[PDB]
Design a protein around this ligand. Structure first.
Ligand SMILES: NC(=O)C1=CN([C@@H]2O[C@H](COP(=O)(O)OP(=O)(O)OC[C@H]3O[C@@H](n4cnc5c(N)ncnc54)[C@H](OP(=O)(O)O)[C@@H]3O)[C@@H](O)[C@H]2O)C=CC1
Length: 160
């Protein structure tokens, strides 16, 4: 069972605020599909709730939602009460949010990280990216320009 994490962060490490992602990067959707299509995607229940009803579940992937709530209904997803329960297919991508990235990092051998060149200083209640330690290796891709007006770039990090 391989596990990867995929996220986008501002240079501050902020990934979420007010139940949403505080930028848009339409051009990076193809990369997100490329990585995740045909695989299991795992997300925390706050990330599931952040997806509009019309976009969820994400098509072409097995959607799994992590919650402690016995009852919890996430229609079009399988709800599980632990991360280890999700991790049963050959390839699983954790697609957010902050709590779940922190839970899943020990299990991961890939992180696909888009860095957005925005000064987005941290504020109370923000969701933050996990911190990568020295075990991680990988390169910094070249800058790309979004029509949203922001530069962004892709880190493909991996470890054994
Ligand atoms: N790339 C990006 O920039 C991304 C940003 N985001 C953003 O991240 C934010 C959401 O992140 P965050 O608030 O950290 O929430 P999460 O999406 O990580 O969801 C947290 C919920 O997951 C469940 N959960 C957490 N830990 C466990 C556990 N150990 N066992 C079982 N269930 C667990 C809980 O559900 P419950 O309360 O039901 O028990 C918890 O409340 C939003 O702003 C979202 O837009 C999301 C995805 C990508």
């Amino acid at each position: 069972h391989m596990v990867g994490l995929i996220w986008a962060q501002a240079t501050s490490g902020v990934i979420g605020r007010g139940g949403d992602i505080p930028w848009r990067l339409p051009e990076d959707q193809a990369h997100f599909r490329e990585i995740t299509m045909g695989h299991t995607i795992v997300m925390g229940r706050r990330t599931w709730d952040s997806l509009p009803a019309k976009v969820r579940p994400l098509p072409g992937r097995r959607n799994v939602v992590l919650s402690r709530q016995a009852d919890f209904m996430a229609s079009g997803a399988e709800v599980v009460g632990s991360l280890e329960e999700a991790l049963t297919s050959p390839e699983t991508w954790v697609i957010g949010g902050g709590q779940v990235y922190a839970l899943a990092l020990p299990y991961a051998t890939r992180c696909e990280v888009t860095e957005v060149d925005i000064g987005l200083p941290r504020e109370a209640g923000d969701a933050l990216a996990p911190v990568l330690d020295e075990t991680w290796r990988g390169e910094t891709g070249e800058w790309r320009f979004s029509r949203s007006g922001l530069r962004y770039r892709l880190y493909s990090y991996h470890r054994s």
